[PDB]
Design a protein around this ligand. Structure first.
Ligand SMILES: Nc1ncnc2c1ncn2[C@@H]1O[C@H](COP(=O)(O)OP(=O)(O)O)[C@@H](O)[C@H]1O
Ligand SMILES: Nc1ncnc2c1ncn2[C@@H]1O[C@H](COP(=O)(O)OP(=O)(O)O)[C@@H](O)[C@H]1O
Ligand SMILES: Nc1ncnc2c1ncn2[C@@H]1O[C@H](COP(=O)(O)OP(=O)(O)O)[C@@H](O)[C@H]1O
Ligand SMILES: [Mg+2]
Ligand SMILES: [Mg+2]
Ligand SMILES: [Mg+2]
Lengths: 165, 359, 359, 165, 359
């Protein structure tokens, strides 16, 4: 418990991402498919990383595989919090669930890893309703699509983002 | 875009009208420390908290916990606002009239749903099979029902309820797996045993003949891999666990099996319609998904019914979610939009409107 | 010292002539494994065995099981030798003449009773009320009879039989107690529900008015303690269970209520004697012991009968065993010793002697 | 199942106690109100304990309360089988039923407790027709009249041996 | 002269029928180098080998090691030839029928015993207390069982098994003694800790009140002398080690305590017999030898059971070996000689003879 708080911008973004409201298709394209959270300059709040996000409307036009490009947004030598809206299909249902991803690469500095790890249990308690968590400590543990599928439903998952595994 | 919620005794099926499969299927439990967890969150904590079933036997007994499940359904599972979508609810057979009004009141006052509807689970299963007359053997998680239906109306005096379903079979499989040296006692290990039951268990056509076969060879033995990588072997327990459905004495119960319960409910109907019920026995629920259960039911009922009656057991391949799939198609019809109970109608007639609009 | 045996549909009343109450009152059931248990012994094993009623509806259908009940009555319940005491038997109305001879043959050849007599249950109830003309509404365990009697002779063409009695009310109470979350399914739990029915159930004068009263307060709720110490609460089920007597549609039956059955049997009699039957309606049996049943019957029959007719329902405080008490007093009279059928008379005329000595 | 048999004397006594034959009042006074059964010296048969019995004629002349004096016959540190003919009255009947009583006090030697308990289900099977069984393991569980009344008919029993509870 | 062998989960009790106490009590362990040592021999070499429990939880899992224990029992402990004496074996509750036949086959073919018999451990404990109906809380070394028994027959559907017994308490005392600076890790030091547990541990009536008492003074501290002469002091660990029986969360277990397990097994029985089980709770096994465990169990069950139920916990002073003493007296009876399964009978019916001769 490092005492790092969660900014109101992150809470507002998460609430918009969780519950889908009836809106025009123009507003549906503005929904966030993925988003990254980072520490502030003073390291006192968890804030939104500007420009590091994926919109639903971008999927299928500029983005082919939303998960592949989301991984590219993860810094190589820095820790980050991620919120991915995973669309997958099991053997008897088509699911759409939010995934909380803790990106703590080994190449990251020790100061970044300590603060992010010690404040992870505080931000996740504010983001109520998330049932999937992915802790990745290297690029090989997050770049593979089957790694996310195993965390979602194990071997029951037969498709991810509309593409078979 | 209407919402279809199937409030089962142990599992809640939810989704959107028009979809082939429910979007969310989660346990219908509320957990409190030995401060409130619903669904898979209650199971993730395992043993710290205590679990309660508010709809344990198809009939809602704790309405405070039932609202928590509904709130978890709309916001956490379906991820939609209940005030923007009409909701179609399902109810167990022999549901008291007080519960129907309580369901309507909660939907309109707590969640402010624009429209609302109640359907009987057994009738939706029968309609999904292309029938209006027949008997539905709905075996779920906490309760088993045999509901004879004539021209789309269930006969309440002939409905029989059996407190023997998949929940009791999961516990029985845990008990008999300890005879092989394994130990499944914790909440986490119970979910492992349930996965074993849904993957390796089957109903034997002849129980005594099958037991002799398993005791003379190893062709019936299957291997299962635990989440931690350990591999266990299960032999005759594959067909012994679902045998408790036909022999409840395996669980220490004095009640009759599902085959005799089906026969007894048919015998409680009019003599002129018993011939139609014999040839229109439809299976529904997750506990009827064991391979070989339709053939076993056909053999057992034939031995009970007169030899001149034609016994036909209907086991559609999608009978596990036939209640939800039938409700989703019904709620997605453009002609069904006039059958909803609007909020305007609720404000005039009160919760009693459900009796004349949904029967 | 004569013996009086009242062979009811579900309970057997036995005792000694001259006593105010029967010595033994035990269920008339024979149990065999799913090797033969009779009476309370058959209920002590609970679910390991299956129960059969040989006299299920007042008429003996299995004479082999009837002898077991009679043997259990004399040796285990009354604890006397049947060959040393005359036995007075009772029979249901519309009992076939073959059954009367079969009963006489069994008593003289199997038990070697020195003397024997047969009396009609309805006539004994009417005599015990100080009447020779009237209609007796005998509601027992497995059958309900409305027997109009004129000058001590029952009118067979006007006797109506209703297959709706305390046995069906016990099952109905079990069914509606599950709406409160309770579960009574086993044989042992059925006896608990019967005890609840005999202690907390009552007949409401106005059913719809009483239903509104129970739904607006808790003054009609009563607490019952289970044998293991748990306490359950019963509300509107107190008057809903006996309401099935007047509204058989609650049980899915097409038959008329006990009030309409009584009225229909009166209308099947001669027009000149209907006035006497209206003012001499006598209740008998255990199922007529619900408080408020005489006032409800008076109100219901009045609405059916013409307004100029005087309706009087007679509910003596000891009507539960009026058949046995009337038989015990009759058999204890010194002048009745010449009414017995002696063994010497049986050896000459055979079993047919009962037709001219007991009518 | 210890294999201990029931002597013919016990069977004859039970048969006389169960079924009442028409007899002169002199023979009615000789009927047994209570009787104790004990193991033989060789522990192979269940026999009648000589001198430990209550006659019907003794009730009302030398015996005031038949149940109180029957309890006094039970040994303090020894097991015993008992047959008590209970006369009681419920709210709607006057009953006379035989009660089989298993007296196994805690102070008894374990050898006596083991043999009597293991052979109880064998003797009770020979005594057909008994519907009441009282298992008392201490003096407080058998000396109270209300304890016997509860076993007979529960709260329905209003009188015992002609005296209200 | 018959032999009585009590095959417990962690300790084997053996002796001759008619004796007050078993002749040999040795651990039921088979050890192999990290070539085969059984009993105290396996513990004498300490850490050079690995120890295995073939009957770890009352149910035999390794029959090859089980025969080694039986061979060590007859020849090294009892010092008799098994072919000259009949042997009475004891089995844990819920023992599979396959194990009973395997026990019979080994006794007659490997050891050539002239006669052989199987008895249930729980039933022998209940009989030794002078009861035929009751619930036995048998807490041994590797397993704890609550076995409700009605008229000498255990109810298999209500038997609950708890994997929490003296073996876990010895390990827990080993863990909590390190908080005082002591170090017990080796196999030899484990036996020292077990001796401390059996001599200085007790169950506190109020755990929280006792903890405050131990933290404010030193009246609860006791001194123990190690085999090498060193003296250690144990304070609050005396009542914390057996407290894990009532609070399994101390060991990281999600299971309920022995008081709740006893209550849960009673509630799985028929409602009409629960009153008898409450007043006939019998303690058995070595783990029930803690002073104050009967008073604590009485207090805990009373808080769970309804206030109208009479809770009586029976803790005979000789309950540690009540299974063996009950078997020795039964096997020494001259009337029991016809209950034995002779070798002649085994040669005709095979190993299946045990099912109809020993139930
Ligand atoms: N393939 C399967 N084979 C056997 N049992 C199954 C299978 N799938 C689900 N079940 C069982 O069905 C039960 C619940 O099914 P369901 O009918 O949805 O319950 P409810 O209707 O009471 O919510 C579960 O306990 C589960 O064990
Ligand atoms: N006080 C009571 N209140 C309501 N019902 C009763 C009462 N006493 C007995 N009964 C019912 O009466 C039925 C049998 O009564 P009875 O007429 O003696 O039987 P039978 O049909 O053998 O003559 C039982 O099923 C019992 O439930
Ligand atoms: N006096 C005692 N106090 C506490 N525990 C004891 C005592 N004597 C033995 N034990 C414990 O009982 C356990 C085994 O007892 P027992 O019931 O004979 O085992 P099993 O029946 O499983 O072979 C041992 O682990 C030992 O720690
Ligand atoms: Mg369902
Ligand atoms: Mg009658
Ligand atoms: Mg043991």
């Amino acid at each position: 418990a490092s005492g790092v708080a969660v900014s109101d911008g992150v809470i507002k973004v998460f609430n918009d991402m969780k519950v889908r409201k009836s809106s025009t298709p123009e507003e549906v394209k503005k929904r966030k498919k993925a988003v990254l959270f980072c520490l502030s300059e003073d390291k006192k709040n968890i804030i939104l990383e500007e420009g590091k996000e994926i919109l639903v409307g971008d999927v299928g036009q500029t983005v082919d595989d939303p998960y592949a490009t989301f991984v590219k947004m993860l810094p190589d030598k820095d820790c980050r919090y991620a919120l991915y809206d995973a669309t997958y299909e099991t053997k008897e249902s088509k699911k759409e669930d939010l995934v909380f991803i803790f990106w703590a690469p080994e190449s990251a500095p020790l100061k970044s890893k300590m603060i992010y790890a010690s404040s992870k249990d505080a931000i996740k308690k504010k983001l109520t309703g998330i049932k999937h968590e992915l802790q990745a400590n290297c690029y090989e543990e997050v770049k593979d699509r089957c790694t996310l599928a195993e965390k979602l439903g194990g071997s029951a998952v037969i498709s991810l983002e509309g593409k078979p595994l | 875009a209407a919402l279809v919620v199937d409030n089962g005794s142990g599992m809640c099926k939810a989704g959107f009208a028009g979809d082939d499969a429910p979007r969310a299927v989660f346990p219908s439990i509320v957990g409190r420390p030995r401060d409130s967890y619903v669904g898979d969150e209650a199971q993730s904590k395992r043993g710290i908290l205590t679990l309660k079933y508010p709809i344990e036997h198809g009939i809602v007994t704790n309405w405070d916990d039932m609202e928590k499940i509904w709130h978890h359904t709309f916001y956490n599972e379906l991820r939609v606002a209940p005030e923007e979508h009409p909701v179609l609810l399902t109810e167990a057979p022999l549901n008291p009239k007080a519960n129907r009004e309580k369901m309507t009141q909660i939907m309109f006052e707590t969640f402010n749903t624009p429209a609302m509807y109640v359907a009987i689970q057994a009738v939706l299963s029968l309609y999904a099979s292309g029938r209006t007359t027949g008997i539905v053997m709905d075996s779920g998680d906490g309760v088993t029902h045999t509901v004879p239906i004539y021209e789309g109306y269930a006969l309440p005096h002939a409905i029989l309820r059996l407190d023997l379903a998949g929940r009791d079979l999961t516990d029985y499989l845990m008990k008999i797996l300890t005879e092989r040296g394994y130990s499944f006692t914790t909440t986490a290990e119970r979910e492992i045993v349930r996965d074993i039951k849904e993957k390796l268990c089957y109903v034997a056509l002849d129980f005594e003949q099958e037991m002799a076969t398993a005791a003379s060879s190893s062709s019936l033995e299957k291997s299962y891999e635990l989440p931690d990588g350990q591999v266990i072997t299960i032999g005759n327990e594959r067909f012994r666990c679902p045998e408790a459905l036909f022999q409840p004495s395996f669980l220490g119960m004095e009640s009759a099996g599902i085959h005799e319960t089906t026969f007894n409910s048919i015998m409680k109907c009019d003599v002129d319609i018993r011939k139609d019920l014999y040839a229109n026995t439809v299976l529904s629920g997750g506990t009827t998904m064991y391979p070989g259960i339709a053939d076993r039911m056909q053999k057992e009922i034939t031995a009970l019914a007169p030899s001149t009656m034609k016994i036909k057991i209907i086991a559609p391949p999608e009978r596990k979610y036939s209640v939800w799939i039938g409700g989703s198609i019904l709620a997605s019809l453009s002609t069904f939009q006039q059958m909803w109970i609007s909020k305007q109608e609720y404000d005039e007639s009160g919760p009693s409107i459900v009796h004349r609009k949904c029967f």
